[PDB]
């Protein structure tokens, strides 16, 4: 109320003293409603002046001045400059104009998309402000549509400078936080546009236990129901809410198989073609909605129709959730069009989640993005990539970027969905990419040349697939614990570098590199490697400090910028000194919690993490070389500790400490033996290989070590030993 | 009155035979104020015709049948139909709509333009018609904004055919003729965006006298006022109106010192960020505008606010003109936006020009164009291209193609002003053109690497610069007449080659050659050199009529379209039979008025040339081989001839007339030296210059010359000896 200013036809709230509220009312009624976007406009209260004279009024906060000159809102009558020295002169907003330095957000989806595509904006900027506007419908008390705010331009001023991380927090606080995943999310996922059986559906669940690839989740796609059995004067099968009798002839048991197993069952809903009088559920929903029969009259999909919700909801999917179908995926791709004007995607998301959560605790969705403020139902579905190595390399910036609108659980299809072409090398760097991004969902097109099946490829993709993927169990407790994060603190699993190193030019100029939660640094690998080293590069930017490869130990001394090379079989992700991270060392078993966990620490400084789990919280301390183990509540746990190299505790039980001072600091990464095998594996000649070798063997000094590979007339193969000369500096 | 008619809501008023200004009104009053573009609509009276029945109304003139079916105005109600073949069905103009032939105008900026950049139309068409809207607001008797016309649609229609000339001094009359500009800005000026001293600027200035450099004009860019010294609660240092003390401790005492070295001094205005309560002018600003101090409230940049710009000439630049600045460069980048609907720019322009004419007679600004009627505040300043190859390949045409809006005074950054590439070449051949432009300004970005200081470059490179901008301050005379023509006659400067050869197909088909003032004709080189000729090229259309180089001699028979090389170091400029060109013979003397003229004549017809001055006008008539020089008023200047190669008479004063008959007409010009030099630079084989040097000695016929080059097996030195052959034919 102090924090709420009216002028002429124009409310202003001072939420904080970096985001305002700004609306106009022809009406003088204001809207204090929430919207589709806004579920809390309840701030604690700030300090800030007014120069309000006759004609004009002036906002003054510790970083924006926003004027209004009275009249409706224009370029002219609405404006703001920022109390920052970002830009020499982009460090205005005017209403109704864009300005530079946005860092972008998302978009609906990745559907038909091979490389790039253009993203909407997001609240985050280089010159410190942007504008959201709320340009979203009422809701109502318990969350339905109410219609038209009375607020008919109503905008949110951020203007936080390069302090991304508070602008995200404070949006959550606006729009609602993300809620918690359930642990399951977390796992992989298995997915495939392909006619199984009950039968070959569980023997491939149980060729995936033989394999020792452990799943979390079974999802079913669009052939669990009728599709070409539907008579043509229907329409399509894409719609269908019919098991296909032939291939699913008794539902629950077969769900009954695949909850004995622990996974998590969905299916695929197309909602656009409504029931059908073809349906095993029309009967029901035709009487409920007093359709004609015998005029096969359609209840055709209407989100905005309350009776049609509920139909939906209790006599469509009702009788398939109690055949066991744990959650659903919503995959709608037919078009924006409603007579309320809410996007049908929008209502999907929003009443599914909320439906979602009567059967399970923390249940999820899987969909495609509705604009913001949709992170309230996760988890996101990016639909129908291209399978490209430009579709590769777009990924990573992508799904850093998201996290500047708060949507931060992107789900992709690993390893492309649809088209393109074939190439094993391009499917292994994007299940690595997958390990390390919100959510591993493996999916592919209705091709039987498409199957992300690790067996599916020559027995070495194969081996780091099946790694890669066991990899992912491992760090279900670290994902975890950054979702329940998430859900509390407003801090993304997935951040660009920028919200770490907000004034380091370097942390602009790496799109693809990324912070995955709060102890690892990852670059993945998105082009084809160069076939004379056989290894694939990116340049990395190393921030100030000491990093580690997180799987090999190979040193960097931060900051620099540093082309790193690996074999297909490799991915770059580094850990700082005093990094901790928890590994699950049971990822094969079938265990709601872990019942084993490693530590796994980098030596050369103090550290510390916070493992947040369903029932408990364990600190792991690293403070002079003494690590301790605590925990809120006490248990069987076993905890393994590995300091750098070794195995120094197995499998001991309850609280802990150990002293580690005098330990092997040292991992065992060495220039030679990685020199050794960069020359062994290079498609370059044998003289070369023998002279780089006895060359960089004989040259005792650094600098004449660098001059040398200097001469080398292959360019990439200068930078590779450089990376390895850099490492062993 | 009888030139005024009206019919339904319109009204047409036939200005000329060939001009009708054409306006609609809803509320039947018509608008008899001045506009932003219109300063007089008074023109004597001129015969037409009219046709005017019931519904339908037909205007008649020499040039023009326009036509109005009443109503609303609509591309089916009103139309003209031009009284010319110049096309087969592109003679008609529809309201609303566009037609083919313009010839284009200009654009506000090149800011961030590498190579060309669309144009706006220009009152020009090979087709001979075009339609000037004129949408600004309405002017008060003293020139401020008055608010909306009551003419809702105000249009010109100008019918002049091809008579370009005509059109432009018409358009003259309707929008008020280009004010004179005073001598010192047809001088060199010097310019970079570069943190000088007082100490460093002088230096500067005196190492210009001493390389024997002339300059008229001393800009100090941004870094004259607080940049970094700026906190950054009040945003950026672009915007400043503080003298930083670390570099200029004592302003009042450097301007004096520039005075004394007889320059000009303009400082940077950037003035969109206003007068923050930082600035030392803050206090008084403060208390004329009854600011908030103790909030630190801004005197945010206003122009439509009276009280504003009052505050802004007498308490903001009025203080720094005290200290000695001579001008203001108003740089303005921050768009088009304001309560007034009045281009910020525009109002800079307009008010600023306004103002500088209290403490100097024809003073100036420099400033970016701010539409059609801008040209009444000279000078143009085009910004921020991009430093290429490209940029300077269409600024040629840029400059010229300006005249078709009556924007003469178009001063470009030469050399470029930013990004792009090294090559000194490009600044050579950039500052050739330059010192053949409207304006030659040097300036540059904030890079250490792109001063336009010559003895940045080579020895070849420096003496070169040093030679062409002494060539600017003996091209001053000339300059100053063409200006006073300018803005006596309606004349530009610079003229496409369709304003004196409109029939001519190839006047449209050499953009980048132009008319210099009435007695030469400039092809300037746009490309890099062919390393193999060691020569840059351009192909040249000449006229009718005997041509010769300006520099040379070398001789050119018109009517031909002929290839033409020069090495880096020369530049194509011809000047006709009969020519006569004054240069000033002290061009580093610091002399108010030349003490002594060079009368350079080329031979072989009559000419005159008449020298207009501030106190005085010189005709020079050379009538059957009998040169004249006579003078309104008497005076102790010392006039120099030179009859082709010869200096005939040194330093005589008063009026005399000479007779030439029996002078030596030839120039030295050779074909044997030029063809013997051509060859020698070439990095072609010594046999090849061997075989040419002797078989092109050897061979007496012309027709058998041309036989032996078209054989070469290099295409442009074939063109490179034809030119030379066609020369010496
Ligand atoms: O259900 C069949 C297919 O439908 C849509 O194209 C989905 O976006 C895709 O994920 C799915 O495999
Ligand atoms: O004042 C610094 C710079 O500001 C703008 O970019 C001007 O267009 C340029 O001419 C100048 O050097």
């Given at each position: 109320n102090n924090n709420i200013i009216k002028f002429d036809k124009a409310?202003?709230?001072?939420?904080?003293?970096?985001?305002?509220?700004?609306?106009?009312?022809?009406?003088?009624?204001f809207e204090e409603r929430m919207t589709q976007m806004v579920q809390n406009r309840e701030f604690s209260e700030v300090n800030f002046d007014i120069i309000e004279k006759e004609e004009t009024i002036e906002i003054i906060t510790?970083?924006?001045?926003?004027?209004?000159?009275?009249?409706?809102?224009?370029?002219?009558?609405?404006?703001?400059?920022?109390?920052?020295?970002?830009?020499?002169?982009?460090?205005?907003?005017?209403?109704?104009?864009?300005?530079?330095?946005?860092?972008?957000?998302?978009?609906?989806?990745?559907?038909?998309?091979?490389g790039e595509c253009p993203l909407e904006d997001g609240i985050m900027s280089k010159n410190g402000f942007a504008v959201l506007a709320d340009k979203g419908k009422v809701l109502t008390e318990v969350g339905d549509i109410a219609g038209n705010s009375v607020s008919t331009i109503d905008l949110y001023l951020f203007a936080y400078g390069r302090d991304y991380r508070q602008a995200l927090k404070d949006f959550y606080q606006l729009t609602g936080n993300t809620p918690?995943?359930?642990?399951?999310?977390?796992?992989?996922?298995?997915?495939?546009?392909?006619?199984?059986?009950?039968?070959?559906?569980?023997?491939?669940?149980?060729?995936?236990?033989?394999?020792?690839?452990?799943?979390?989740?079974?999802?079913?796609?669009?052939?669990?129901?009728?599709?070409?059995?539907?008579?043509?004067?229907?329409?399509?099968?894409?719609?269908?809410?019919?098991?296909?009798?032939?291939?699913?002839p008794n539902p629950e048991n077969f769900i009954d198989e695949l909850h004995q197993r622990k996974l998590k069952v969905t299916?695929?809903?197309?909602?656009?073609?409504?029931?059908?009088?073809?349906?095993?559920?029309?009967?029901?929903?035709?009487?409920?909605?007093?359709?004609?029969?015998?005029?096969?009259?359609?209840?055709?999909?209407?989100?905005?129709?309350?009776?049609?919700?509920?139909?939906?909801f209790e006599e469509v999917h009702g009788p398939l959730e109690k055949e066991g179908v744990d959650f659903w995926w919503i995959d709608w791709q037919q078009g924006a069009i409603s007579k309320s004007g809410v996007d049908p995607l929008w209502?999907?998301?929003?009443?599914?989640?909320?439906?979602?959560?009567?059967?399970?605790?923390?249940?999820?969705?899987?969909?495609?993005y509705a604009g913001p403020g949709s992170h309230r139902y996760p988890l996101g579905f990016s639909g129908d990539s291209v399978i490209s190595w430009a579709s590769l390399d777009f990924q990573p910036y992508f799904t850093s970027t998201a996290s500047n609108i708060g949507y931060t659980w992107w789900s992709h299809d690993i390893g492309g969905h649809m088209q393109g072409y074939k190439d094993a090398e391009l499917s292994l760097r994007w299940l690595q990419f997958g390990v390390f991004s919100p959510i591993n969902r493996l999916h592919?097109?209705?091709?039987?040349?498409?199957?992300?099946?690790?067996?599916?490829?020559?027995?070495?993709?194969e081996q780091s697939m099946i790694d890669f993927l066991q990899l992912r169990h491992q760090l279900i407790p670290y994902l975890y614990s950054a979702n329940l994060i998430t859900a509390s603190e407003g801090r993304a699993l997935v951040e660009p570098l920028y919200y770490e190193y907000p004034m380091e030019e370097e942390a602009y100029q790496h799109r693809n590199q990324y912070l995955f939660g709060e102890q690892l640094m990852v670059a993945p690998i998105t082009e084809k490697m160069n076939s004379l080293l056989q290894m694939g590069s990116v340049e990395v930017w190393f921030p100030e400090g000491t990093w580690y490869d997180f799987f090999s130990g190979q040193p960097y001394d931060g900051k620099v910028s540093l082309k790193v090379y690996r074999e297909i079989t490799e991915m770059p992700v580094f850990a700082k000194a005093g990094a901790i991270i928890p590994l699950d060392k049971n990822p094969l078993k079938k265990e709601e919690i872990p019942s084993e966990i490693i530590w796994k620490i980098f030596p050369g400084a103090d550290g510390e993490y916070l493992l947040l789990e369903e029932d408990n919280e364990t600190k792991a301390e690293f403070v002079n070389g003494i690590?301790?183990?605590?925990?809120?509540?006490?248990?069987?746990?076993?905890?393994?500790?590995?300091?750098?190299?070794?195995?120094?505790?197995?499998?001991?039980?309850?609280?802990?400490?150990?002293?580690?001072?005098?330990?092997?600091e040292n991992f065992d990464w060495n220039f030679s033996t990685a020199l050794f095998r960069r020359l062994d594996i290079a498609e370059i000649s044998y003289e070369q290989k023998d002279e780089i070798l006895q060359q960089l063997s004989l040259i005792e000094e650094h600098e004449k070590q660098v001059a040398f590979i200097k001469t080398n007339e292959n360019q990439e193969l200068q930078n590779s030993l450089f990376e390895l000369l850099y490492s062993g500096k």
């Open positions: 409310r202003f709230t001072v939420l904080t003293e970096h985001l305002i509220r700004i609306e106009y009312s022809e009406t003088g009624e510790s970083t924006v001045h926003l004027y209004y000159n009275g009249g409706e809102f224009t370029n002219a009558s609405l404006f703001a400059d920022v109390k920052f020295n970002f830009s020499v002169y982009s460090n205005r907003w005017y209403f109704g104009e864009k300005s530079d330095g946005n860092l972008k957000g998302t978009t609906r989806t990745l559907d038909m998309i091979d918690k995943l359930p642990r399951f999310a977390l796992g992989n996922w298995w997915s495939r546009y392909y006619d199984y059986s009950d039968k070959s559906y569980l023997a491939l669940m149980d060729k995936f236990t033989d394999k020792k690839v452990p799943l979390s989740v079974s999802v079913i796609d669009m052939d669990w129901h009728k599709v070409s059995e539907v008579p043509s004067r229907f329409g399509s099968g894409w719609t269908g809410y019919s098991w296909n009798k032939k291939l699913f299916l695929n809903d197309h909602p656009a073609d409504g029931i059908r009088a073809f349906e095993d559920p029309y009967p029901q929903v035709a009487q409920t909605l007093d359709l004609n029969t015998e005029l096969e009259e359609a209840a055709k999909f209407d989100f905005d129709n309350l009776k049609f919700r509920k139909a939906y209502l999907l998301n929003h009443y599914q989640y909320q439906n979602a959560q009567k059967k399970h605790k923390n249940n999820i969705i899987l969909s495609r592919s097109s209705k091709s039987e040349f498409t199957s992300k099946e690790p067996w599916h490829f020559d027995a070495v993709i690590f301790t183990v605590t925990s809120k509540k006490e248990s069987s746990r076993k905890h393994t500790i590995i300091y750098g190299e070794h195995e120094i505790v197995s499998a001991k039980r309850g609280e802990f400490s150990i002293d580690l001072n005098g330990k092997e």
